[PDB]
């Protein structure tokens, strides 16, 4: 599936099976734009988290209960949700995916 294939491709499951990962089907320019949108608190108290005004197409890849390295396995869940990201630096850009509301 797409998630086994994408996780492979991006070096996310070559030396370890990453439990969860979300891929955003939007232009980089448009996800970077989220850092200047709705400011919200992060799960850890900090407030350098922002929520997109709109929903974006995303694919969540959850590892199964059975999957073990080196044979990783992912459940593919496609959706459209408001992404929540944390931003840092200049230019202020996303560095961490905080969630999908």
């Amino acid at each position: 599936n797409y998630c086994n294939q994408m996780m492979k491709s991006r070096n996310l499951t070559k030396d370890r099976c990453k439990p969860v990962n979300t891929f955003v089907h939007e232009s980089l320019a448009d996800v970077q734009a989220v850092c200047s949108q709705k400011n919200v608190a992060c799960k850890n108290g900090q407030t350098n988290c922002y929520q997109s005004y709109s929903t974006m197409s995303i694919t969540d890849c959850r590892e199964t209960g059975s999957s073990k390295y080196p044979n990783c396995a992912y459940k593919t869940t496609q959706a459209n949700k408001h992404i929540i990201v944390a931003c840092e630096g200049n230019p202020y850009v996303p560095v961490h995916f905080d969630a999908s509301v």
Binding site: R10, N11, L12, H25, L28, T59, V93, P94, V95
Partner: peptide, 15 residues
């Protein structure tokens, strides 16, 4: 290695 903004893009972007 790579910066945090680069890793984010490699891990989460799929335009």
């Amino acid at each position: 290695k790579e910066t945090a903004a680069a890793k984010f893009e490699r891990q989460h972007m799929d335009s």
